[PDB]
Amino acid sequence: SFKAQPFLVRNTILCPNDKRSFTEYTQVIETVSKNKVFLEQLLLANPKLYDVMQKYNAGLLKKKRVKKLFESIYKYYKRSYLRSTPFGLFSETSIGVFSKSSQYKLMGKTTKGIRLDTQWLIRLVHKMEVDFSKKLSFTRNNANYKFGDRVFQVYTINSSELEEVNIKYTNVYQIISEFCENDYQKYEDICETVTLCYGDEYRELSEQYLGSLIVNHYLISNLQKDLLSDFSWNTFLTKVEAIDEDKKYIIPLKKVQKFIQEYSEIEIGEGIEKLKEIYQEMSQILENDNYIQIDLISDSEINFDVKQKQQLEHLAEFLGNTTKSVRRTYLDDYKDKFIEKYGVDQEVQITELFDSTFGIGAPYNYNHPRNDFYESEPSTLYYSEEEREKYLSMYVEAVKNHNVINLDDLESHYQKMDLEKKSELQGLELFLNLAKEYEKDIFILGDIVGNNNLGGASGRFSALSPELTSYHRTIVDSVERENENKEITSCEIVFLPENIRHANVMHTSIMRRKVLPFFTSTSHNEVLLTNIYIGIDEKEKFYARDISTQEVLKFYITSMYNKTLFSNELRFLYEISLDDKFGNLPWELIYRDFDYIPRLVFDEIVISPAKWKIWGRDVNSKMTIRELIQSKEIPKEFYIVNGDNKVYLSQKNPLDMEILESAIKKSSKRKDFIELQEYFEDENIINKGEKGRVADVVVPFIRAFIREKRVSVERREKLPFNEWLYLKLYISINRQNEFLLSYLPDIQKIVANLGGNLFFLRYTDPKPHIRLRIKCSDLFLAYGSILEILKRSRKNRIMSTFDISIYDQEVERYGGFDTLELSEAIFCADSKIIPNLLTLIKDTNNDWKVDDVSILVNYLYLKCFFQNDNKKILNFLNLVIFYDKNFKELKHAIKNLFLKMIAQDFELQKVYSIIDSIIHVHNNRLIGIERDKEKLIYYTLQRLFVSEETKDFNLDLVSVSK
Amino acid sequence: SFKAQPFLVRNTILCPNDKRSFTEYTQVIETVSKNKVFLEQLLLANPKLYDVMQKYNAGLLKKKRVKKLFESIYKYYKRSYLRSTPFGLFSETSIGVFSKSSQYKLMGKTTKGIRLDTQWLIRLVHKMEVDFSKKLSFTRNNANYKFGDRVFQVYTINSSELEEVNIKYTNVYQIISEFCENDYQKYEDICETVTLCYGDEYRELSEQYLGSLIVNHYLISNLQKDLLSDFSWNTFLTKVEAIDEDKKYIIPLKKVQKFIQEYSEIEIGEGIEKLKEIYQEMSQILENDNYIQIDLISDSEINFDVKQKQQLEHLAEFLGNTTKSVRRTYLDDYKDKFIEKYGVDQEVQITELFDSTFGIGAPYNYNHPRNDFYESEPSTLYYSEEEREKYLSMYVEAVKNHNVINLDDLESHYQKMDLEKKSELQGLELFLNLAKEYEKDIFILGDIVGNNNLGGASGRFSALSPELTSYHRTIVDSVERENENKEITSCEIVFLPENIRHANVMHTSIMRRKVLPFFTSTSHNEVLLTNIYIGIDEKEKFYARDISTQEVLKFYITSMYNKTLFSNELRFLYEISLDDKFGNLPWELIYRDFDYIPRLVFDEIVISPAKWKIWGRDVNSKMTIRELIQSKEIPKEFYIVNGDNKVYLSQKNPLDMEILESAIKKSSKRKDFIELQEYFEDENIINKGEKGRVADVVVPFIRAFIREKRVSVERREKLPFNEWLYLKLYISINRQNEFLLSYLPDIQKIVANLGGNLFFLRYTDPKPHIRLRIKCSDLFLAYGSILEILKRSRKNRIMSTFDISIYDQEVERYGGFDTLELSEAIFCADSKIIPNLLTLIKDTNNDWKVDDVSILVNYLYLKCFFQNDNKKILNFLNLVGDQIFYDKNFKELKHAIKNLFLKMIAQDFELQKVYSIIDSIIHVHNNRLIGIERDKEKLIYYTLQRLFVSEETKDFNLDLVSVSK
């Protein structure tokens, strides 16, 4: 069911057959200093470490910082021959395909894919902005959003890393931001727009107010347009020309462009001096740690079998199926918190949603920022207990027998299980290293494993050649077409990363219909952040909508950027645009604490290499570091895993055993461990000049749309002693009935005397309590009269405390405010009669029971609503009178609502939803917290009908920490 | 540090050398039905099963209960030869001692320790109550307690169901119970007491209400006095005489006593016919599933080495030391919930404490009421992350190498740890089986392992012989002497178990100064439940106090009754009287989920045998149960462990393999597992007639209480719009200051004009909010006026919602209500000045930051309290610019600080109370001025030291209700 696409092949430039072992560090520096390819590789990747090695080979590098130079150069040597991961001059990227026969020779030719350093370039533009503000034009930053009397940003940039800044919302800010919304405006024009409405005596205030907006990036200049996204040398230069009077930047910049173009055509290794020039010009313009990005691409075309294509598709099936056991996630708990605050009939503006005071904050696992209210970790189920038992069992088995762990043992388990079988998972990208064992070619999953972000790995390389652009577009096309059918608008989120040294990773080509910019600007169609609303669909899944066009959105970060470094809102928009199930393989979660893990395999694929944990506390004194790793049986060759980089180490190499001793005592300082993996021969499969290359691959594998805008607090919240009085009476479940029987009647009478009405509700959340809501002329007079009764209920220990709370009306849920009022009329009339049914159920001398009264009043409800019908009643019933008493009141109120519903052409769908509620809140009053027995009373009721058929220039700037 | 006492020896009566193998079940049933000793053993231990076996080999047993009868009888056969655990006619108890040499021959003679069946006896006595009421006298059940308009019992018994029952609190119940509260009262006199203030026309109602009180066990009769606890045949018999005119009960009971007394002198095996008499006699009186308890005791005297005394004491040190790593428990979390509700200056009545509506519920782990409000599992540290890493490491090491796990690897670690602390742990009882491996004598800990309950194992056997009574009293003597030193009054909790079929286990003989009775009564001095109040030490530790005598109490259940089957309140009283640390060995917790655990060892003691988990789900096709236990390398002999019973099995025995196959498919359908353990040869160490006995042993090893009774809800809670108006204003932390700057002043001005006062406070949990408290004449006018300001703060999105809540005054913390009022005056004056300090800090032109203003106000508070006397101020501190002093509201503050100080001096507050109050008052100023993240606060004290150093009719109702538990 998973179909493997053509794939990226990444392989190293040097060949590991030319690697040589070293025994002395000084010895390394010389072989390296005579290695032409290596020296250019280092000058490009890491200019500052490069200059330090020059300072070495010219006598005076201060001899305290010599070892660090050593350790670094050795690791860079290792990284240059081993380790296939794409990065400037070290290794190259190419397209692979499937055919009827394998092909591993690289016949094609190598290109340089050159980019400015994004951190350099951004720093430059900010230099120019400060110089030429009055000659530029500025637009509004989409990151801005008004909240109350303040103007926030989703995140802050110009900071020195600690502070988040917000300003006050003033007339001046309004004029300026409205004037620059979806528009650029020369500095001068902005200034006048405010003076043409304030006076010319205020020109000076304007110039600095505007000055402040540009400094704290509430306004971005025309220079930042397409700077990151679809950068052009020519449009960049044109823009700079017009503003650069003294030719201070334009002349040096063209030399840089010229040299880069010259550098482009040079071979790899015989280009060090041309590169030296390139830094020199750029260094003079502005120093940065790095100046140039390079992505090596290539003409080659590696081929895989048909046995290989199935083998990979088999693995994609298996990995996908394990998700079937993800029952409950952090987003699910988030979804639940959403449903309790907002109804199920509300779309909420996303900045409001994520506010921890006016909304509900973020998911438990989110960190930017983490919630500041207290919360305990939500229950999450990522695999079943039965499954966890099998996994631990397979583990102790494999350890005891000194064997591999065979994951395929559970393949049937995952395929035969489907339950609700929707196939939520839409596609994968796996990351596989190529290697050998016992002279046989094998796949090895990286620690990376992969993810469900199609296009993720290719997005960076897409713009480097039309064959790549074509490749990207095809991978992306799966999701894009499935979006076309469901009439969903896609958006790339395009942003200036908070941490500016992460800028080079943001990069990708926009393949989506629109764009969400942050601290930047593009030519694509852009969504405003404050137009984004979040709702929940009929099957209870999050969705985003642009309220201004009513379109539905899915958002994309089509890159290898860490998806957890985003502000909460951005992370959310991403995550609801995928399936929430891939990410937590069971074996990773279950085996993580063990200090030895067997190799994990699946159908001859190595799922994970064997892993070791080595602890500081174990090197002892009569137990050497070498003797220790032999005691735990680490092989001659192995990796140490720092993060997402591993370094090759050999037990037989003296330098390497040093590296190990260094690593083990830095973790020692921290009461920590160090991670080892076993090694695979990975040097002789992909070849070029009859020499092997280290290689990895990345294989991609492939209705009531209503919903009301959330109504404002001012219209929806009914404050104490306005129209309503709302009390939370804390009463234990065992005693609520007695309160309703023997206390409520008195209360109802008091409120009757004042010609008002009341309805109540039963709740469990916080602690058990009854929610009283009273509508009446003199509310405070009513409170005082109630209070005596409450005092008695406290005295008898029926009720502990109470609160007087704001009544938050469920407007959206019950139609308009109009339909709401009549619903409330039903609530009261229903409340009015409940003590009577309860008296009645309680009575022994005859009848009834509870569940009879339940079934009977739902029926009375349905008859009333649908006018003694049955075809109307049954069609409603398939998705889910005679006694006088006070039912005259209830029937009457049900009547008025049915009439007003019909009077305003409520759709059938709206009417059912509203009706279900009225029945639901009745069930709440009559009997307790009811769950799915709601649908059983509905299920039971089918049968019965079946059988019948001036200082606003202030900018009060504030900063917070973290 | 642990010194081993004389120990209990428990050994089997039969000898395992005379055990025999069987091949088919019918072969067992026949061998058994002609085995003299087994039949008397069976007739005593399990009467209904005996009759099922009789019904079987006489044709009459329905052929579905045949399999059950078969397995059951096999296991009881195994259990009579194997299994040293003490229990009627199967095995016997004796005292063991240490000397200079081992001695394993049992020389003594075996005696019967016979007791009636407690379920039999109590059920009988309950009938007599219903029959002979008017001829009896009654006392109040201590389990009773008033709460509001109801009368509950901490648990219910007359439940022959799963229901808990409570009645209405009526004037009649009050009269009857206060009358019967401290002693017994003739049926007649209770009745008069009711009619003498209701009328003689109510006599008929009195008789009925009183009855229903007895029916539902709200009252105990004089029959129950010492019934369970210190039962005497004659004091019991005499009482029955006085009420039984028709001699319907007395004549058979005397027969029962005579038959039992005759049974006593009979040997083991030769009594089947005498027992049958006892059953027939007692069954005619009252049928029950069991009739007779027997605890076999013996004068024998097994001896252990001096190497053995070290070996055990070494093990006790090690086990005890591991508790050193228990940092935080479920009781530690509860202690914290206590302090959040009540603070530290309150003693709370235990029934209120445990109420989930009016109190704080129970500890997280309690289940007799598990809490009904939602709660997430508390953080607990029973071992460190480093320790856990070590155990896992040792686990993977041992499995990979097919070795034992040597707990010795960490003896050095636990021993050298935390030498500066005294260990709360005052003693252990360890439970050890005796066995061999490679012909060498070894100790093996039970899975039970043991506990920190001294006297637990001996309490049951205590009354059976003067040598036993002496032995028990000696173990208990440690605890009891130390209780005397600390001036602590001890209580045994004496109770009829909720599950009336557990009746026989409650039994222990009373060694403590008082007794806390439930559904029974004794002759000792008794504590009332509703007199027990709970407080906290200066050292943050729970204690119990009898409010009527001001005594401090520690509580004891000196038996083997499962300490988790108690009502919460009872469980709590038990557990706070011990260390909260022993019970969770780290390896037990950490290895718990592995479906193979290696043998755990320590100094030649086997701490735990190797354990296996075998699953139903794994017997499918080509995989037979025998093939399965072979693949997991189950040894030839092994135990299957159901619960507190293990059954012996051998792979070479066909029947044993049948038992197993049955065990696994009963687990299959429920999709769970079965537990196996390795076997140790254990039959020929302790001997009698030159034949071995299966044996285990159980070895025991060895200030200002102020605090106010909690002020009542009615007296402490100030309802909305009476004297006070209280708003919870929900405002984010980042913007609270701003609110205090540009909104509170307007509010303060509103309430000012109405001639009242307000004080505020910052809180963080639930969600951040400011607690506003206003005192004023016309509160509802003040609300409406304020309300506009608040709506303006909503608009600006500074405040989201607010609540109007009940103000729970902190009386105890701030002295009486008198000193409270005066503190409140300070709270308000202090609140008045915070907007200026905040402006003054917000002002750039100052150069006064937050921490400068802080110390200056902290300094000024102290100059006030101790009237500029720098030397007193320093003494206070040693247990832990001008524009402000001239500021109009700081003068108000100074006055208020003075007025409190006067009343404090006037009421002879102990010096420490005063220090404490000041500290609180200073703490809440800090709260108002700056946030609430703390202890960088007591840093304010340290620096402030520097500044002062450097200045040198229908209420007969019984409205009975039932709940569903």
Name the CATH code of domain A716-946 (choices 3.10.180.10, 3.30.70.100, 3.40.50.12500, 3.40.630.10).
3.30.70.100
Backbone φ, ψ for residue A287 (5° rounding):
-75, 145
- DSSP per-residue letters across A277-330: HHHHHHHHH---S--EEEEEEE----EE-SHHHHHHHHHHHHHHHGGGG--B-H
Does B787 touch chain A if contact means CB atoms closer than 8 Å?
Answer: yes
For residue A788, which residues of chain B lie inside 8 Å, CB to CB? none
A-facing residues of B in 798-817 (CB < 8 A) are: 798, 800-806
**Strands, DSSP E only, in A806-849?**
807-808
Does B399 touch chain A if contact means CB atoms closer than 8 Å?
Answer: yes
Cβ distance A399 to B400 less than 8 Å, yes or no, reads yes
Instruction: Using CB atoms, pick whichever of B357, B396, B593 lies closest to residue A732.
Output: B357
CA distance A717 to chain B (A): 9
- Percent helix, strand, coil in chain B, to 5, is 45, 20, 35
What is the separation of C-alpha B623 from the centre of its chain, rounded to a whole number of angstroms? 46
DSSP secondary structure letter of residue A576: T
CA distance A152 to chain B (A): 12
CA distances, B187 to each of B138, B190, B958 (Å): 7, 6, 19
Instruction: Using CB atoms, pick whichever of A399, A713, A780 lies closest to residue B399.
Output: A399
Does B732 touch chain A if contact means CB atoms closer than 8 Å?
Answer: yes
Instruction: Using CB atoms, pick whichever of A150, A373, A399 lies closest to residue B767.
Output: A373
Residue B14 has which token pair?
């039969």
DSSP secondary structure letter of residue A596: E
Bridge partners (DSSP) listed for residue B807: B718
Distance in Å from the first CA to the final CA of chain B: 46
For residue A798, which residues of chain B lie inside 8 Å, CB to CB? 148-149
Instruction: Return the SS3 of B23.
Output: coil
Backbone φ, ψ for residue B349 (5° rounding):
-65, 130
Does B869 touch chain A if contact means CB atoms closer than 8 Å?
Answer: no
Q: What is the residue type of A866?
A: F
DSSP secondary structure letter of residue B788: H
Strands A757-763 and A686-687: unpaired
Strands B637-641 and B646-650: antiparallel
Other C-beta atoms lying within 10 Å of the C-beta of residue A14? 23
DSSP secondary structure letter of residue B311: H
Interface with chain B: mutation pick from A403, A804, A806, A807, highest number of B CBs within 10 Å: A804
Alpha-carbon span A199 to A202, nearest angstrom: 6
Cβ distance A800 to B596 less than 8 Å, yes or no, reads no
Alpha-carbon span B414 to B322, nearest angstrom: 6
A-facing residues of B in 12-51 (CB < 8 A) are: none
Instruction: Using CB atoms, pick whichever of A671, A714, A767 lies closest to residue B386.
Output: A671
Residue B82 region by backbone torsions, left for phi larger than 0, else alpha for psi between -120 and 50, else beta: beta
Alpha-carbon span B539 to A22, nearest angstrom: 63
Ranges of CATH 3.30.70.100 domains, chain B? 715-809
Q: Are B120 and B205 in contact (CB under 8 A)?
A: no
CA geometry: angle at A143 spanning A142 and A148, to 5°?
105
For residue A731, which residues of chain B lie inside 8 Å, CB to CB? 357
Cβ distance B787 to A393 less than 8 Å, yes or no, reads no
Q: Which residues contact A186 (CB under 8 A, 6 or more apart)?
A: A136, A137
Backbone φ, ψ for residue B582 (5° rounding):
-85, 130
Alpha-carbon span A162 to A217, nearest angstrom: 17
Cβ distance B596 to A714 less than 8 Å, yes or no, reads no
Q: Are B83 and B695 in contact (CB under 8 A)?
A: no
State this model's resolution in angstroms. Answer: 2.9
Instruction: Using CB atoms, pick whichever of A358, A731, A960 lies closest to residue B800.
Output: A358
Does B386 touch chain A if contact means CB atoms closer than 8 Å?
Answer: yes
CA geometry: angle at A707 spanning A531 and A555, to 5°?
45
Positive or negative, the Cα torsion across A360, A361, A363, A364?
Answer: negative
Bridge partners (DSSP) listed for residue A597: A611
CA distances, B675 to each of B629, B635, B842 (Å): 12, 14, 69
CA distances, B21 to each of B80, B84, B292, B861 (Å): 14, 20, 31, 87
Instruction: Using CB atoms, pick whichever of B147, B393, B783 lies closest to residue A595.
Output: B393
For residue A358, which residues of chain B lie inside 8 Å, CB to CB? 797, 800
- DSSP per-residue letters across A230-253: S--HHHHHHHHHHH-TT-TTHHHH
- Asked if the peptide bond before residue A369 counts as cis, ω within 30 degrees of 0, the response is yes
Q: Are B269 and B36 in contact (CB under 8 A)?
A: yes
Chain B residue with Cα closest to A355:
B732
Looking at A17-117, list the stretches that DSSP marks H as alpha helix, in order from N- to C-terminal side.
25-33, 36-45, 47-56, 66-81
Residue A585 region by backbone torsions, left for phi larger than 0, else alpha for psi between -120 and 50, else beta: beta
Q: What is the residue type of A497?
A: P
Q: What is the residue type of B432?
A: L
Alpha-carbon span A876 to A912, nearest angstrom: 7
Ranges of CATH 3.30.70.100 domains, chain A? 716-946
Alpha-carbon span B383 to B587, nearest angstrom: 10
Q: What is the residue type of B912?
A: Q
Cβ distance A148 to B796 less than 8 Å, yes or no, reads yes
Alpha-carbon span B285 to B96, nearest angstrom: 41
CA distances, A410 to each of A387, A601, A604, A771 (Å): 9, 12, 15, 51
Backbone φ, ψ for residue A587 (5° rounding):
-70, -40
Bridge partners (DSSP) listed for residue B521: B225
Instruction: Using CB atoms, pick whichever of B389, B720, B801 lies closest to residue A806.
Output: B801
Does B671 touch chain A if contact means CB atoms closer than 8 Å?
Answer: yes
Please give the biggest Cα pair distance in chain A: 108
Other C-beta atoms lying within 10 Å of the C-beta of residue B177? 21
Taking the CA atoms of chain A, what radius of gyration do you get in angstroms?
34
Taking the CA atoms of chain B, what radius of gyration do you get in angstroms?
35
CA geometry: angle at B122 spanning B119 and B123, to 5°?
80
Residue B321 has which token pair?
């030391």
Q: Are A520 and A224 in contact (CB under 8 A)?
A: yes
Residue B124 has which token pair?
């009988």
Instruction: Using CB atoms, pick whichever of A765, A787, A798 lies closest to residue B719.
Output: A787
Strands A757-763 and A769-775: antiparallel
Residue keyed to tokens 């499962």: B562
Q: Which residues contact A221 (CB under 8 A, 6 or more apart)?
A: A125, A129, A133, A136, A137, A138, A139, A214
CA distance A770 to chain B (A): 13
Bridge partners (DSSP) listed for residue A807: A718
Nearest in space to B1 (alpha carbons), one of B353, B281, B320, B300:
B320
A-facing residues of B in 597-626 (CB < 8 A) are: 615, 617
Nearest in space to A698 (alpha carbons), one of A363, A468, A936, A432:
A432
Does B939 touch chain A if contact means CB atoms closer than 8 Å?
Answer: no
Residue A246 has which token pair?
């003294």
Residue A539 has which token pair?
């099957």
What is the SS3 assignment for A267-280?
A: CCCCCHHHHHHHHH
Instruction: Using CB atoms, pick whichever of B357, B671, B797 lies closest to residue A148.
Output: B797
Does B98 touch chain A if contact means CB atoms closer than 8 Å?
Answer: no
Q: Are B243 and B535 in contact (CB under 8 A)?
A: no
Chain A residue with Cα closest to B596:
A396
Cβ distance B804 to A800 less than 8 Å, yes or no, reads no
Cβ distance B766 to A734 less than 8 Å, yes or no, reads no
- DSSP per-residue letters across A466-493: HHHHHHHHHHHHHHHHHHHHTTEEEEEE
Q: What is the residue type of B163?
A: E
Nearest in space to A82 (alpha carbons), one of A31, A17, A168:
A17
Chain B residue with Cα closest to A793:
B148
Alpha-carbon span B116 to B292, nearest angstrom: 5
Within 13 A of B590's CA, how many CA atoms are on the CB side?
22
Within 13 A of A598's CA, how many CA atoms are on the CB side?
22
Instruction: Return the SS3 of B865.
Output: helix
Does A783 touch chain B if contact means CB atoms closer than 8 Å?
Answer: yes
**CATH architecture of the domain covering B715-809:** 2-Layer Sandwich (3.30)
Backbone φ, ψ for residue B569 (5° rounding):
-60, -50
Q: Are A953 and A213 in contact (CB under 8 A)?
A: no
**Strands, DSSP E only, in A621-768?**
637-641, 646-650, 673-678, 686-687, 692-693, 695-701, 708-709, 717-718, 724-731, 757-763
Residue A489 region by backbone torsions, left for phi larger than 0, else alpha for psi between -120 and 50, else beta: beta
Other C-beta atoms lying within 10 Å of the C-beta of residue B265? 10
Alpha-carbon span A909 to A912, nearest angstrom: 5
Alpha-carbon span B321 to B302, nearest angstrom: 29
Does B886 touch chain A if contact means CB atoms closer than 8 Å?
Answer: no
Alpha-carbon span B821 to B715, nearest angstrom: 14
Does B781 touch chain A if contact means CB atoms closer than 8 Å?
Answer: no
Cβ distance A596 to B396 less than 8 Å, yes or no, reads yes
Residue keyed to tokens 């006095």: B225
Does B839 touch chain A if contact means CB atoms closer than 8 Å?
Answer: no
Alpha-carbon span B834 to A560, nearest angstrom: 51
Q: Are B229 and B520 in contact (CB under 8 A)?
A: yes
Residue keyed to tokens 């909010």: B769
What is the SS3 assignment for B150-203?
A: EEEECCCCCCCCCCEEEEECCHHHHHHHHHCCCCCEEHHHHHHHHHCCCCHHHH
For residue B150, which residues of chain A lie inside 8 Å, CB to CB? 796-797
Alpha-carbon span B699 to B160, nearest angstrom: 39
Alpha-carbon span A432 to A447, nearest angstrom: 10
A-facing residues of B in 343-362 (CB < 8 A) are: 356-358
Alpha-carbon span A196 to A191, nearest angstrom: 9
Alpha-carbon span B18 to B27, nearest angstrom: 17
